[PDB]
TrEMBL record:
The chain holds residues 154 to 202 of 1174 of the full protein. It comes from Sus scrofa domesticus. This is DNA-directed RNA polymerase subunit beta. Belongs to the RNA polymerase beta chain family. It is found in: Nucleus. RNA-dependent RNA polymerase that catalyzes the extension of a non-coding RNA (ncRNA) at the 3'-end using the four ribonucleoside triphosphates as substrates. An internal ncRNA sequence near the 3'-end serves as a template in a single-round Pol II-mediated RNA polymerization reaction. May decrease the stability of ncRNAs that repress Pol II-mediated gene transcription. DNA-dependent RNA polymerase catalyzes the transcription of DNA into RNA using the four ribonucleoside triphosphates as substrates. It comes from the Eukaryota.
DNA sequence: CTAGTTGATCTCATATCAGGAGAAGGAGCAGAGCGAATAC
RNA sequence: AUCGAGAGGA
DNA sequence: GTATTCGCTCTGCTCCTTCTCCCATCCTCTCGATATGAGATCAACTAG
């Protein structure tokens, strides 16, 4: 699950609620946690179809 | 001499796209050149 | 430790 | 008996195809993946 996505537990949480889960409110999300490692998918250019 | 004990070692057996450049080969055509082969 | 990958530095 | 061809070979010439090679130096870091014993043989004992 990508963090801060709709299906993330951090979805819709207030800055209170994030801090109260030990999360940074300024953290944008948009990445995955695989084996504890934060992984970000890079958009890949391709020639339109 | 001469049999019995001790280790090592081997076999065998048990289941279940937006590269490029150059060198080497083969291909097909083109002709040259010489043997034979009709033929005047 | 090896391999690969990635991100960087000059 | 010499023209004249003429079939056949011998290169040889472009060209297209294949294939094989190469693509700066050095340095740092992180991160993920990556059996067991029985029997036989032989050789050293280990003594008789």
């Amino acid at each position: 699950i990508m963090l801060r996505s709709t299906y993330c537990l951090l979805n819709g949480l207030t800055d209170r609620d994030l801090c109260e889960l030990n999360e940074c409110p300024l953290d944008p999300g948009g990445y995955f946690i695989i084996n504890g490692s934060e992984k970000v998918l890079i958009a890949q250019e391709k020639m339109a179809t």
